Amino acid sequence: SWARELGLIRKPASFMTSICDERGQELIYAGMPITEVFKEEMGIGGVLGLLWFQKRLPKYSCQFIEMCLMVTADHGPAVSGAHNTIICARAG
Amino acid sequence: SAKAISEQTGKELLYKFICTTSAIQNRFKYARVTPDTDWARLLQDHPWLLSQNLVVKPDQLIKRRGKLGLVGVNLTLDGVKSWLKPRLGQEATVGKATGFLKNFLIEPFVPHSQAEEFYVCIYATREGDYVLFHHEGGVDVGDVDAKAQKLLVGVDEKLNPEDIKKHLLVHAPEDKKEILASFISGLFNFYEDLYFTYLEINPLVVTKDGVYVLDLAAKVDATADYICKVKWGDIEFPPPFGREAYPEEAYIADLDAKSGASLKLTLLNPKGRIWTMVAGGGASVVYSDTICDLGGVNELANYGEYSGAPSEQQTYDYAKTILSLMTREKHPDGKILIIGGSIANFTNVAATFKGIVRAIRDYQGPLKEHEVTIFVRRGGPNYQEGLRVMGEVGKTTGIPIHVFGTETHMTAIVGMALGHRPIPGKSTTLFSRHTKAIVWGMQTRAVQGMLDFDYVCSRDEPSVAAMVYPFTGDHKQKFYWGHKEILIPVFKNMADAMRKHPEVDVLINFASLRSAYDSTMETMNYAQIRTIAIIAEGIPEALTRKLIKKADQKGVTIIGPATVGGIKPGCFKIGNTGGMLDNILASKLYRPGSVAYVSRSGGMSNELNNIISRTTDGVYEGVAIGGDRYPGSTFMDHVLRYQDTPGVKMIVVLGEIGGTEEYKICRGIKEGRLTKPIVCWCIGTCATQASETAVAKNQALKEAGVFVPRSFDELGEIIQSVYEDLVANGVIVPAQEVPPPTVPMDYSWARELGLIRKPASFMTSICDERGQELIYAGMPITEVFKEEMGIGGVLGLLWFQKRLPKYSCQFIEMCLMVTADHGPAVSGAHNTIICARAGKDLVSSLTSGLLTIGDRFGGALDAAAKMFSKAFDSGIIPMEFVNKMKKEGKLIMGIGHRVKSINNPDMRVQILKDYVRQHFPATPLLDYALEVEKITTSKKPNLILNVDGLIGVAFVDMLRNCGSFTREEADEYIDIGALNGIFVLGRSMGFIGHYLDQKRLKQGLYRHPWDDISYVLPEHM
Ligand SMILES: CC(=O)SCCNC(=O)CCNC(=O)[C@H](O)C(C)(C)COP(=O)(O)OP(=O)(O)OC[C@H]1O[C@@H](n2cnc3c(N)ncnc32)[C@H](O)[C@@H]1OP(=O)(O)O
Ligand SMILES: O=C([O-])CC(=O)C(=O)O
Ligand SMILES: O=C([O-])CC(=O)C(=O)O
């Protein structure tokens, strides 16, 4: 930690992460800080465009992402995955 | 690498793979007699042997036996028996060489005349294949090259027989002109389908009866075996005829064969005082040349090398053999051991010196007894700590060891060892600062070294535009540019590499010795690639000549095979030339100089960079052409290239023994084409065509106007003398030294020599994966399998890190056999089936069913162990325990079966109960659980012990009451969850069985019908 602080050593980094700069003064998302996220009033479609695609999508596309996350919510407990969730929840 | 084969082997290969109209007689008619075999077996399997008249001659790679009269012709049984009696197995001499005669060949002798003997030969040259035919065969040659007809055939060119009869058959008898020529044509295909370099048949007897190949000789390309191992079968190369090898020499031979290192040792005078063990090939040749200059032609004990960074056991045994060989008998002028060497490219010098210091301290007694003095001189990455450890073992064990770094001359230390001095078309520019390369192959340390060099030489763009690796997709690899990280694209094909990067003009071919030719031929189908550097070693020479031919046709500058590359300082660096960046900064290779050089071996190029750094201004551009026989660009192709560039003022050439290449430099300096001051020196004297030697080329360049030193010791001195000549004439001005940019060093290299501590996480007291054996808990994998412990023993090793006693390993196998599948109706196997019928995966199905192992399903093992252990540890009677559980809700976990309980048992509680009764010392918690079973079966005819409760209490009974668990480890593993581990690892077999079953019955997706659901939703939310 000291030989790298005064910068006399090389260490190759893994985990290249082109998303979510967590350290510093703000949670920078794709390139947009968190206060700019809540200032432009982009919903979860805007942060899906920022996290998943790293692009500020236009406001008709964020609302379509929220629409297609509202229709692909629950579709009854008969289906195979919701059945497994219920079976695993009833085992407590 | 031409290696001469036995004439028995080449003669049987000629008998097997020739295809011609002329019938070869005596097909498969030969015998090999030797001292290791008898005589009756040869007559037993070859019944043709004593039917005719025979000729017997020694097959031990001996030239000129027909002129010297050492052949026994016209021999019957008495001739072939009493001829070998003064000959088979006795010591004899030919030329200089003295040794045994243990190999003799027996051929059916054919009487014939001297007007029927012919002479045919095919030898390889750089510009093609020469076939050479004299009508007068045998030993009566007369004139040799004048009346014998020659024909140069080109590479990748077909031999036309009309040019055979037109040009080569001038002095032939005409009736054999269809017998010989097509045969020769067939022989030419035999030369071209088996990759010979030299094949001379003399004499070839073309009688009226047919053709007879009595005597031949063949040097074959030993590196082409990957093409022709189906043709040669198991080829055998005989050693050149000489004395017998010591056991030490065969010991070093199997040390050489057993790894990727080069451990060469051949003793010269075993009672000698000056013993050499020196890293590098050219460095060994130069040290042997200099010690032969200083009167040690009888005092050099051996010539050898240790190269390719051997392991410290290999280094230890190699130095052990050389140290034991030099303590046999004392020599009164003192015995010297020279651990010399060139500058190491990337090897940590201190690790090889750990090998040396173990091999010296292990054999120190004979060293201080025989009064041995050790002279050590090395260079490279971290040489200074290695000189320090050699110095401390010099002062510690008392052996006088004189250590030296790169500040000294390389081979002047032997002058300090002997007391002679006291001890202290093709383009003319190849690389520019916009030269971009494409590397072929994942050779990331070479690309990182090139990027470090180009940061240090203040270059603005990295000279590796892309890499090419065919065995992976297109991605980008992260490299270091100074401090920063950049992304260099790695491609799959070369076509989209040349497409996306049109500024490339160099390709550096890091492919192997069998894929260099195809990638190089594919590369020259792109016009922008103007030079190709081929780092591979071991290409067959015919494929190299095809590469040279297509290079001259396309106009590219091939650096030649078996190179290390060639460094143009301040500008560009090919691969691993120069070495690690410590040698680049130590030799001032970050700014251009004025001296160019051309060498052959890569081991001498670092020494030449060191010499030109320490004596003169520095290297403008250096090129190592390759240690192969046909380099892609010779000496003249580079000194002509240094002629036209004005930045260079003087040229240094390091030539080698063999190959009339420096005579072309002599003719170029006599024709007035080479005007810049040349300093040539040719290595390889070895005087312990007669013009191809080192002293011949040295004298011929000395008389031609080229500065040639007396030895290698005066090479730096006269290079400094020519530099002082050239600056005093007022043309060489030394440029002003700007300091280079600095790179940070490495985390891998600073921790290797230990200069930066790092806190390690992930403490892992289990499974040392690295080393020779996969060491489980403290016990290797061979001790696991040899001691015959099942999977219960490896669960004791992985989970508990103890070697459990043999009755409890079988108990863990037992309780993993009963906690396997228990039907598919239960909740977890139901989830596995539901996920397997969705066609998912094995691991996703097992995992989706495994995530149910919780508290209600599968959580009776751990709870039924914890409950009974807390009741027993407290110390209450069972009748109070049942009443305590009744008073608080909380049904006793591990007690209760739905169907089978009393005189209708569970039948797998019974097997486990019989096992914990029989093979199992001192089991009190099971007895307590059986008393609680007595009470709760007195309550209800159900309520027998479960299998969950009995595995729980039997496992807690196994932990604390067998050995090796104290009381706080056996109580730790219950609270950690080592019983949930047994239920999950046991039930994993059942869940994978359910996955494979539902995947094998081809079952469709589940739906769980609506009539089993009863939706109870609110009215309007
Ligand atoms: C032909 C004809 O018509 S019949 C003639 C006349 N008919 C009659 O008289 C009717 C008789 N009625 C019966 O026989 C009924 O079976 C009954 C009412 C007595 C039920 O008796 P049971 O089944 O034994 O009681 P129950 O199911 O609650 O369990 C009994 C015990 O097991 C205990 N127990 C159950 N599970 C566990 C467990 N895992 N761990 C520890 N204890 C347990 C219970 O706590 C209970 O304990 P307790 O006796 O201290 O209260
Ligand atoms: O790059 C090279 O060929 C040199 C090398 O690795 C070594 O010295 O072991
Ligand atoms: O251990 C468990 O609770 C699961 C079990 O035996 C069962 O199939 O009923």
- CA dist B836 and B851 (Å) reads 15
Q: Which amino acid is at B12?
A: E
Query: Per DSSP, which regions of B59-183 are E strands?
Result: 72-75, 92-94, 97-99, 104-108, 117-125, 128-134, 149-153
Rounded Cα distance between B445 and A30, Å, is 33
Q: Which residues make Cβ contacts (< 8 Å) with residue B321, sequence separation at least 6?
A: B248, B251, B252, B265
State the Cα–Cα distance between residues B554 and B427, nearest whole angstrom.
12
Classify the C-alpha dihedral A8-A12-A16-A18 as positive or negative: positive
Name the resolution in angstroms. 3.4
For residues B191 and B171, give the distance between their C-alpha atoms in angstroms, rounded to a whole number.
Answer: 24
Selected residue of A84, A85, A86 to mutate for chain B interface (largest B Cβ count, 10 A): A84
Please list the residues that pair with B568 across neighbouring strands.
B572
Q: Of B959, B985, B986, whose CA–CA distance to B800 is shortest?
A: B959
Rounded CA gap, B570 and B591, in Å?
4
Distances (CA, A) of B924 to B237, B291, B866, B929, B1008: 76, 84, 15, 9, 48
The domain of B302 spans 247-418
Q: How far apart are CA B896 and CA B937, in angstroms?
A: 9
Pairing of strands B619-624, B595-599: parallel
Residues of B in contact with A8 (CB under 8 A): 744-745
Tell me if chain B has a CB within 8 Å of the CB of A89: no
Chain A nearest C-alpha distance from B485 (Å): 8
d(CA B848, CA B842): 10
Closest partner residue to B852 (CB to CB) among A9, A78, A88 is: A88
Distance B952 CA to ligand 1 centre (A): 27
In order of B307, B389, B933, B1006, the CA distances from B922 in angstroms are 64, 59, 19, 51
Residues in chain A: 92
Tokens of B676: 């810049």
Residues 6+ apart with CB under 8 A from B190: B14, B17, B18, B19, B199
**Residue that is written with structure tokens 């005064």 in the block:** A6
Amino acid letter, residue B327: T
Distance (Å, whole) CA B926 – CA B585:
75
| Ligand closest to the CA atom of residue B852 | 3
The DSSP secondary structure of B706-772, one letter per residue, reads -B--SSSTTHHHHHHHHHHHHHHTT---PPP-PPPP-----HHHHHHTT-S---------S-B-SSS
Q: Do B744 and A83 touch (CB under 8 A)?
A: no
Could you give the 3-state DSSP secondary structure of residue B264? strand
- Does the beta carbon of A18 lie under 8 angstroms from any beta carbon of chain B? no
Are residues B573 and B587 in contact, defined by beta-carbon separation less than 8 angstroms? Answer: no
Place of tokens 């060994």: B284
Structural tokens at position B178:
């269809």
Q: Which residues line ligand 1 (CB under 6 A)?
A: B 886, 891-892, 895-896, 936, 939-940, 943
Rounded to whole angstroms, the Cα distance separating B441 from B492 reads 10
Distance of CA B258 to the CA centre of its chain: 11
Distance CA B389, CA B382 (A): 12
Tokens of B141: 């040659």
Q: Do B745 and A91 touch (CB under 8 A)?
A: no
Mutate one of B998, B1008, B1013, B1014 to test the A interface: name it (highest A CB count within 10 A): B1008
Please say whether the beta carbons of B130 and B123 come within 8 A.
Answer: yes
Question: Residue B470: left if φ>0, alpha if ψ -120 to 50, beta else—which one?
Answer: alpha
String of DSSP letters for B909-960 = HHHHHHHHHHS-S--HHHHHHHHHHHHHHHH-S---B-HHHHHHHHHHHHHH
What is the C-alpha to C-alpha distance for residues B648 and B428, in angstroms, rounded to an integer? 13
Q: What is the dihedral of CA B299, B305, B311, B315, to 10 degrees?
A: 0
Rounded CA separation B675/B701 (Å): 14
What is residue B357's three-state secondary structure? helix
Q: Is the dihedral of CA B881, B887, B888, B892 positive or negative?
A: positive
Which of B747, B848, B1010 comes nearest A11 by C-beta?
B747
Residue B101: φ, ψ to 5°: -125, 85
Distance of CA B407 to the CA centre of its chain: 32
Q: If phi over 0 gives left and psi between -120 and 50 gives alpha, with beta otherwise, what is residue B884?
A: alpha
The single-letter code of the amino acid at B108 is P
What residue type is A27 in one-letter code? L
Distance from C-alpha of B776 to C-alpha of B951, rounded to nearest angstrom: 26
Tokens of B402: 């004189």
Residue by residue, what is the 3-state secondary structure of B408-444? Answer: CCCCCHHHHHCCCCCCCCCCCCCCCCCCEEEEECCCH
- What would the two tokens of residue B65 be? 């036996």
CA distance B440 to B494: 9
Task: Report the alpha-carbon distance of residue B338 to residue B335 in Å, rounded.
Answer: 10
**Helix-, strand-, coil-residue percentages of chain B, each rounded to 5:** 40, 15, 45
Distance CA B197, CA B705 (A): 36
- Taking the centre of ligand 1 as the mean of its atom positions, its distance from the CA of residue B901, in whole angstroms, is 15
Quote the CA–CA distance of B874 and B892 in Å, as a whole number: 16
Range A10-13, long-range pairs (CB < 8 A, 24+ positions): A10/B480, A10/B483, A10/B743, A10/B744, A10/B745, A10/B746, A10/B747, A11/B747, A12/B478, A12/B480, A12/B485, A12/B747, A13/B478, A13/B485
DSSP state of B902: S
DSSP assigned state of B174:
G
- In degrees, rounded to 5, the angle at the alpha carbon of residue B372 between the alpha carbons of residues B610 and B396 is 85
Find, among B158, B230, B238, B234, the residue nearest to B194 by Cα.
B230
Which residues of B are annotated binding-site positions?
57, 65-66, 108, 110, 117, 215, 256, 259, 261, 308, 345, 347, 363, 378, 701-711
The phi and psi torsions of B430 (rounded to 5 degrees) equal -115, -40
Q: Which residues of B26-49 are buried (b: 16+ CB within 10 A; e: fewer)?
A: beeebbebeeeeeeeeeeeeeeeb
Asked if B283 contacts B413 with a C-beta cutoff of 8 angstroms, the reply is no
In angstroms, the CA B500 to CA B559 distance is: 25
Q: Which residue of A has its CA nearest to B485?
A: A12
What Rg value do the Cα atoms of chain A yield, rounded? 20
Which 8-state DSSP code applies to residue B564?
A: -
**What is the Cα–Cα distance from B831 to B514, expressed in whole angstroms?**
53
Listed in order, strand segments (DSSP E) in B240-334 are 262-267, 274-276, 302-307
Q: ∠ CA(B684), CA(B689), CA(B690), 5° rounding?
A: 60
Please name the amino acid found at residue B121. Answer: C
Residue pair B121/B63 in contact by the 8 Å Cβ criterion: no
Edge to edge, the sheet with strand B104-108 lists B31-33, B104-108, B54-58, B72-75
Element (H, E) at B80: helix B77-82
Q: Which residues of B345-370 are buried (b: 16+ CB within 10 A; e: fewer)?
A: bebbbbbbbebbbbbbeebbeebeeb
Q: Which residues are registered as beta bridge partners of B58? A: B104
| CB pair distance less than 8 Å for B1010 and A79 | no
SS3 B395: helix
Question: Which residues are paired to B151 by β-bridges?
Answer: B131
* Cα–Cα distance for residue pair B427/B138, rounded to 1 Å: 49
| Per-residue tokens: B258 | 């057993």
- DSSP-derived letter for residue B498 is H
CB-nearest to B756 from A9, A13, A91 is A9
In sequence order, which residues have a C-beta less than 8 Å from that of residue B69 and are 6 or more positions away? none
Peptide bond into B677 cis (omega under 30): no
Interchain pair A12, B478: CB under 8 A: yes
B832, B991 Cβ separation under 8 angstroms: yes
From B556, B474, B565, B490, select the one nearest B522 (Cα to Cα). Answer: B556
What is the spatial distance between Cα B327 and Cα B330, in angstroms, rounded to a whole number? 7
Which residues in chain A have Cβ-Cβ distances shorter than 8 Å to B852? Answer: 87-88, 91
Q: Which atom of ligand 3 is nearest to the CA of B946?
A: 6
- Rounded-to-integer distance, Cα B271 and Cα B956, Å: 73
Nearest chain A CA: its distance from B792 CA (Å): 30
Task: Quote the crossing angle between the two packed helices B909-918 and B806-818, to the nearest 10°.
Answer: 170
Contact predicate B417/B336, CB 8 Å: yes
B750·A87 Cβ contact <8 A: no
Structure tokens at B714: 């005066």
- CATH number of the domain to which B291 belongs: 3.40.50.261
Ligand nearest to the CA of B888: 1
Q: How far is CA B849 from CA A87, B827, B830, B859, in A?
A: 10, 8, 7, 15
Experimental method: cryo-EM
Query: Which residues have a Cβ under 8 Å from the Cβ of B229 and sit 6 or more positions away?
Result: B235
Residue B198, SS3 per DSSP: strand
- Partner-chain contact A87 B852, CB within 8 Å: yes
Q: What SS3 state is found at B537?
A: coil
Sort out which chain B residues have CB atoms less than 8 A from A15's CB and list them: none
Cβ–Cβ gap A13/B830 under 8 Å: no
Q: Which residues contact B796 (CB under 8 A, 6 or more apart)?
A: B789, B802, B803, B804, B808, B809, B812
Pocket of ligand 2 (CB under 6 A): B 308-309, 344-347, 576
Rounded distance from Cα B828 to ligand 3 centre (Å): 10
The one-letter amino acid at B990: G
Phi and psi for A27 in degrees, rounded to 5? -70, 95
Locate B224 and state its tokens: 């082409």
Is A92 part of the contact surface with chain B (CB cutoff 8 Å)? Answer: yes
DSSP3 helix / strand / coil % (chain A, rounded to 5): 45, 5, 50
According to DSSP, the β-strands at B54-58 and B262-267 are unpaired
Alpha-carbon distance B165 to B149, whole Å? 11
Name the token pair of B304: 């050898």
CA distance B589 to B456: 9
What ligand 3 atom has the least distance to the C-alpha of B983? 1
The token duo for B545 is 């000549």
Ligand 3 binding pocket (C-beta < 6 A) is B 822, 826, 857-858, 860, 948
Q: Can you tell me the distance from the alpha carbon of B683 to that of B715, in angstroms, rounded to the nearest whole number? A: 12
DSSP class of residue B49 equals: G
Residues of B in contact with A79 (CB under 8 A): 1007
Check if B1000 contacts A (Cβ < 8 Å).
Answer: no
Q: Tokens 């060497």, residue?
A: B341
